[PDB]
Coordinates of C-alpha atoms and ligand atoms in Angstrom, one line a residue:
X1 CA 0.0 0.0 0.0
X2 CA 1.3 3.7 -1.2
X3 CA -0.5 6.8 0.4
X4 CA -1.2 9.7 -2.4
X5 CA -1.0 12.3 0.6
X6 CA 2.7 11.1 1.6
X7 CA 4.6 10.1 -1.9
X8 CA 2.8 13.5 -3.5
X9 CA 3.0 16.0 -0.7
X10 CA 5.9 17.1 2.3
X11 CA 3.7 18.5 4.6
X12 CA 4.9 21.7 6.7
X13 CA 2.2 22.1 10.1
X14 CA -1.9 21.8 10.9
X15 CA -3.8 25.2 10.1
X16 CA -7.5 23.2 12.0
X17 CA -8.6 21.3 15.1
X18 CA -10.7 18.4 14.0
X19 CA -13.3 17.0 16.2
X20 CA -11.3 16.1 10.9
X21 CA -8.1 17.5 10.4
X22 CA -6.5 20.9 7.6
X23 CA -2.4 20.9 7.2
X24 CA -0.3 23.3 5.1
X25 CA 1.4 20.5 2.5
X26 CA 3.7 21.5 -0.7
X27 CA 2.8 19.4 -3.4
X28 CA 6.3 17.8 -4.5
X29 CA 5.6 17.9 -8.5
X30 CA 4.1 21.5 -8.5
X31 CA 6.2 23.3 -5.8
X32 CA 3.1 25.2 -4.5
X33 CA 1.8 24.9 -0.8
X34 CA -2.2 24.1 -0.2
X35 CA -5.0 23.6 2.1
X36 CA -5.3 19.9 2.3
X37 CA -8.4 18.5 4.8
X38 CA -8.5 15.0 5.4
X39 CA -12.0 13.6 6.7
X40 CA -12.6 10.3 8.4
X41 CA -15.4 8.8 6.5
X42 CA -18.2 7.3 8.4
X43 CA -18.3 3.4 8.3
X44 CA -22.3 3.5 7.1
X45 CA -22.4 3.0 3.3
X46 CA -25.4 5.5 2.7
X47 CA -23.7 7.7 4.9
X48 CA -20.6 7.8 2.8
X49 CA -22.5 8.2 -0.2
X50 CA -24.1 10.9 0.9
X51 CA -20.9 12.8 1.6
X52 CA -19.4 11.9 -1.6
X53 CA -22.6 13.0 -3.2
X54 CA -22.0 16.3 -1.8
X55 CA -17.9 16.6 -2.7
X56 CA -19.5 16.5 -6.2
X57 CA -21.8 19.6 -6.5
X58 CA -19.1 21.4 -4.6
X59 CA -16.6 20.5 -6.7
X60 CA -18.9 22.7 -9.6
X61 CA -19.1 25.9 -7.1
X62 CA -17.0 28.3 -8.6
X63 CA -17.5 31.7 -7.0
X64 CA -14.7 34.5 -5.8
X65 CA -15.6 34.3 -2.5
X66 CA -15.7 30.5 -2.2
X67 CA -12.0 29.2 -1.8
X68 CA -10.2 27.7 -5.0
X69 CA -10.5 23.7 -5.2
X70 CA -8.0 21.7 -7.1
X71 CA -8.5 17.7 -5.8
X72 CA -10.3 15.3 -4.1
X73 CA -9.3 11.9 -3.0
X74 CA -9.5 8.4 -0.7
X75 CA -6.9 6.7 0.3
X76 CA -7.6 3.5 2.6
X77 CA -5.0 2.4 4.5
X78 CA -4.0 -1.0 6.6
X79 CA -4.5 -1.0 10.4
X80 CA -1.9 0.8 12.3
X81 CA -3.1 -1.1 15.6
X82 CA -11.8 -0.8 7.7
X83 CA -11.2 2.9 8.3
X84 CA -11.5 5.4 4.8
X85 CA -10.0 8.8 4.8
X86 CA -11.6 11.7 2.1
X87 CA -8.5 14.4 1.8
X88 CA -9.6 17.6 -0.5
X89 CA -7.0 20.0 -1.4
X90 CA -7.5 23.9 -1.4
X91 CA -6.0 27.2 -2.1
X92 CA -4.1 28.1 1.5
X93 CA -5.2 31.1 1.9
X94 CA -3.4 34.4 4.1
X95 CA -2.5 33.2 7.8
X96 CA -3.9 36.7 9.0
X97 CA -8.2 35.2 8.9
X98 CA -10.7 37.6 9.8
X99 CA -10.8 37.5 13.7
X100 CA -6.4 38.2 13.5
X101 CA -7.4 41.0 11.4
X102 CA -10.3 42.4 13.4
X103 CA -8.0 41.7 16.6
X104 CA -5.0 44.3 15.3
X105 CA -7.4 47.1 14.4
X106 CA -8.9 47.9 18.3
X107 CA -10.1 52.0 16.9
X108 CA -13.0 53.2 14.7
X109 CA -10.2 55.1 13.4
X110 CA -8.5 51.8 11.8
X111 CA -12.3 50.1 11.1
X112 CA -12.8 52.3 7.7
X113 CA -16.5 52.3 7.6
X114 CA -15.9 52.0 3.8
X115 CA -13.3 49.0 4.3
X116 CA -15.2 46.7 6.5
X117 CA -18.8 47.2 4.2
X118 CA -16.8 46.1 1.3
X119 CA -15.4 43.0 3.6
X120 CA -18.9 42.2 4.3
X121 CA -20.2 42.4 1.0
X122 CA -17.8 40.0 -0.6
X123 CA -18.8 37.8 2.8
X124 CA -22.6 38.3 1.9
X125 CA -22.0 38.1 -2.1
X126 CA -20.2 34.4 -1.2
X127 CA -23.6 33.4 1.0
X128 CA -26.1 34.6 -1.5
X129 CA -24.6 32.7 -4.1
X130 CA -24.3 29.3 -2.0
X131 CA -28.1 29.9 -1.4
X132 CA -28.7 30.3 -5.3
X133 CA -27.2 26.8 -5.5
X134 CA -29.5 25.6 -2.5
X135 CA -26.5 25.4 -0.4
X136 CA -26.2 26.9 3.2
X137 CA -22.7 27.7 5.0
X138 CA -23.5 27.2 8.4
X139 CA -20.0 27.7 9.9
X140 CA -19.7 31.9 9.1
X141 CA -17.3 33.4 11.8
X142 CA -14.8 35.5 11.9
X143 CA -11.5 32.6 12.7
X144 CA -13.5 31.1 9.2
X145 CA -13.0 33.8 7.2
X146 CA -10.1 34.4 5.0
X147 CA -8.6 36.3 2.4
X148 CA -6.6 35.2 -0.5
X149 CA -2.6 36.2 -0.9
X150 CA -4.8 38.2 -3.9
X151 CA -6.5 40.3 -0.2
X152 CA -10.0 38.7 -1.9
X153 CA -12.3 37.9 1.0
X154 CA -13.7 34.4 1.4
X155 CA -16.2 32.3 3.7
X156 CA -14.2 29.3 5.2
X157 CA -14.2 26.0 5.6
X158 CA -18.2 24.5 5.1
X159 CA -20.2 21.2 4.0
X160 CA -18.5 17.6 4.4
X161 CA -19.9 16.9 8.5
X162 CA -19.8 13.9 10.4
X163 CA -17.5 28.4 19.9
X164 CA -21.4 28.8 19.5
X165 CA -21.3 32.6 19.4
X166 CA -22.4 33.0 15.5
X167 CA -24.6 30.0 15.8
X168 CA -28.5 31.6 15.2
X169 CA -30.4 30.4 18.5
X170 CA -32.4 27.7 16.3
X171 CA -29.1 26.3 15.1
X172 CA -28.3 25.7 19.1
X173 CA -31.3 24.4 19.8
X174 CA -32.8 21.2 17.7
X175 CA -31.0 20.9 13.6
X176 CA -30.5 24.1 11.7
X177 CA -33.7 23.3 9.7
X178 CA -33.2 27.0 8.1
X179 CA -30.7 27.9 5.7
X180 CA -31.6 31.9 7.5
X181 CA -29.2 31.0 10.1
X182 CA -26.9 31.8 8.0
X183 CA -28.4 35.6 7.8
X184 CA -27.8 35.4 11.5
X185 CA -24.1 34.9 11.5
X186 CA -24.2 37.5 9.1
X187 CA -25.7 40.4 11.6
X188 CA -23.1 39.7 14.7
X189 CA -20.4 39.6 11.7
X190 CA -21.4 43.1 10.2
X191 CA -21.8 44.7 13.7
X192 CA -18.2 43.5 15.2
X193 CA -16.6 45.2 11.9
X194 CA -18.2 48.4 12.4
X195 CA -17.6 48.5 16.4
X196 CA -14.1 47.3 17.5
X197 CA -13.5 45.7 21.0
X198 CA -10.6 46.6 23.6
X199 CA -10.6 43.2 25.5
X200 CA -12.0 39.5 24.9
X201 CA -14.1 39.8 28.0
X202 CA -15.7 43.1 26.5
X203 CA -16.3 41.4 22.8
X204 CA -18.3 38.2 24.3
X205 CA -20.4 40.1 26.9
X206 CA -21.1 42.6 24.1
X207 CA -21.7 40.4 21.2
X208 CA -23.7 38.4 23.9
X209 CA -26.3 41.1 24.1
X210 CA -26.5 42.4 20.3
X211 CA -28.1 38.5 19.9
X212 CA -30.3 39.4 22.6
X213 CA -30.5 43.0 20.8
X214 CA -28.7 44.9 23.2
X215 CA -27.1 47.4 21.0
X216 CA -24.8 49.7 22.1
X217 CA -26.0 53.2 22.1
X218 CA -22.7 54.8 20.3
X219 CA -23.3 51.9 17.4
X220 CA -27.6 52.8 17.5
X221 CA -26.3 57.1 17.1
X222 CA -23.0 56.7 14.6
X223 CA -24.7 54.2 12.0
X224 CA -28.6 54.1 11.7
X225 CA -29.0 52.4 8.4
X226 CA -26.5 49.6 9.0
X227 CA -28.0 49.4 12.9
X228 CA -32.0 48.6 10.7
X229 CA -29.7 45.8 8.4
X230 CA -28.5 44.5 11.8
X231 CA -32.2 44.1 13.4
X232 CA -33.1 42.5 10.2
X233 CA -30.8 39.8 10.1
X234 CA -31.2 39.0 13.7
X235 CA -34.9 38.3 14.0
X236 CA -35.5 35.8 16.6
X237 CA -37.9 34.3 14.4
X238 CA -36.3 33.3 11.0
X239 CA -38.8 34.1 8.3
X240 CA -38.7 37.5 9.5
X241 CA -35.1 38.0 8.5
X242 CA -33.8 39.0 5.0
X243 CA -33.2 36.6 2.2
X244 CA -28.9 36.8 1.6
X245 CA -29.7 39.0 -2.1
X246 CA -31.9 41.6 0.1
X247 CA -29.1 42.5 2.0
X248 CA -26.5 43.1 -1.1
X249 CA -29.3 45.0 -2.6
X250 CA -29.2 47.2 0.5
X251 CA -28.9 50.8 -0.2
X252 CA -26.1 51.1 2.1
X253 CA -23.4 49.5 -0.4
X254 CA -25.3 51.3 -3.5
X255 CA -22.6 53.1 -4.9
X256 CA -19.9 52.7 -1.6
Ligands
LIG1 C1 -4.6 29.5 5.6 C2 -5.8 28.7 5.4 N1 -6.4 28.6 4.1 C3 -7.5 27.8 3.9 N2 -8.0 27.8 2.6 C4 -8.1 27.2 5.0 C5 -9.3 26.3 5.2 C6 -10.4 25.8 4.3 C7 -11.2 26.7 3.7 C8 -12.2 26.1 2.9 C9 -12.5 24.7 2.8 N3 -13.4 24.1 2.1 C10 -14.4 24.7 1.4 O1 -14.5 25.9 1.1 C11 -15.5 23.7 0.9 O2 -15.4 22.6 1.8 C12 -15.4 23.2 -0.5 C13 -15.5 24.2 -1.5 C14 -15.5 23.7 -2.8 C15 -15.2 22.4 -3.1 C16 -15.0 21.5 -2.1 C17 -14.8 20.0 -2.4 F1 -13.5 19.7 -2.2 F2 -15.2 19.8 -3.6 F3 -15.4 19.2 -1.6 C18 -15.1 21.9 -0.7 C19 -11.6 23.9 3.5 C20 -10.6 24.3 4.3 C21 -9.7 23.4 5.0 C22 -9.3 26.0 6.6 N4 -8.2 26.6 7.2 C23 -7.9 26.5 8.7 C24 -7.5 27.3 6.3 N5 -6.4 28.1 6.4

């Protein structure tokens, strides 16, 4: 038995905890350094073809916010002590992810208004289109958010399953029936660009109570359009929240 992963990649560290698993690897032939995941498959057949049945229509998603896919493979290897791994190899994208760059800009000052709208709106462009295609993200956050070595925005890692603080409340509580709770993460994400924190303890107690519609009153005064947007999306009750086109369509990125 040969492993693809080994012979055809040197791999350099792990960029995600897996609970599977995302190195940094060089492919050997083509010199350039990737995103490689490799899932542990289920042992259910109809379980594994119901992965495998998604891989495909992902495989056909090309979108500039959705992160560049070159390969997807199985290897399955003998017993180191009938196990089947699925590794899929993506663009590595900058180190620096959304939270690292919200996390070194702690001033309005640094937070552009004009910057972090055009952020979001590549992040809300990405989820509209994976709606079009009947697809939800489910895992929006700012640690799953990256941008390209290009500075191109892109929603993370998504699809392929086997901190709750973005989660919508319905997502928490029973299966995230809705593909709105995707508009949810949306909301907390749009707010935390346009109001910077000083300290962690300050960001979860604050973000805590915007889900809860707390709003602080500096944010409510200093942006009223974006503060309606932010309502919006974070409707407790999820028909009442905007479809992912309404909010591109939003006057507030009109002409930026
Ligand atoms: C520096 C860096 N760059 C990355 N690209 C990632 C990723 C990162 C981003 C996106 C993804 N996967 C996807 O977007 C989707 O699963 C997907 C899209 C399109 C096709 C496929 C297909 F392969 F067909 F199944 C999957 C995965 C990782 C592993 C995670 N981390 C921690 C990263 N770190």
């Amino acid at each position: 038995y040969i492993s693809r992963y080994l012979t055809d990649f040197e791999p350099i560290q792990c960029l995600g905890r897996g609970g599977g698993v995302v190195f940094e690897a060089k492919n050997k032939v083509d010199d350039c350094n990737y995103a490689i995941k490799r899932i542990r498959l289920p042992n259910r057949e109809l379980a594994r073809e119901k992965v495998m049945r998604e891989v495909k229509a992902l495989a056909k998603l090309e979108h500039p916010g959705i992160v560049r896919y070159f390969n997807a493979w199985l290897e399955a290897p003998p017993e180191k002590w009938p196990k089947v791994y699925l590794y899929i190899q993506m663009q590595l994208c900058r180190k620096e992810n959304l939270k690292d760059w919200m996390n070194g800009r702690c001033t309005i000052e640094e937070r552009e208004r004009s910057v972090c709208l055009h952020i979001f709106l590549q992040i809300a462009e990405a989820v509209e289109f994976l709606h079009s295609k009947g697809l939800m993200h489910r895992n929006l956050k700012p640690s799953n958010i990256f941008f390209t070595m290009d500075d191109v925005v892109k929603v993370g890692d998504f699809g392929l399953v086997t901190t709750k603080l973005y989660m919508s409340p319905e997502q928490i509580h029973g299966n995230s029936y809705s593909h709105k709770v995707d508009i949810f993460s949306l909301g907390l994400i749009l707010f935390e660009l346009l109001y910077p924190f000083s300290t962690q303890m300050e960001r979860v107690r604050t973000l805590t109570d915007v889900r809860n519609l707390k709003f602080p009153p500096l944010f409510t005064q200093k942006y009223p359009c974006e503060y309606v947007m932010v309502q919006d999306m974070l409707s407790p009750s999820p028909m009442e929240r905007p479809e992912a086109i309404n909010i591109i369509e939003n006057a507030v990125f009109e002409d930026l």
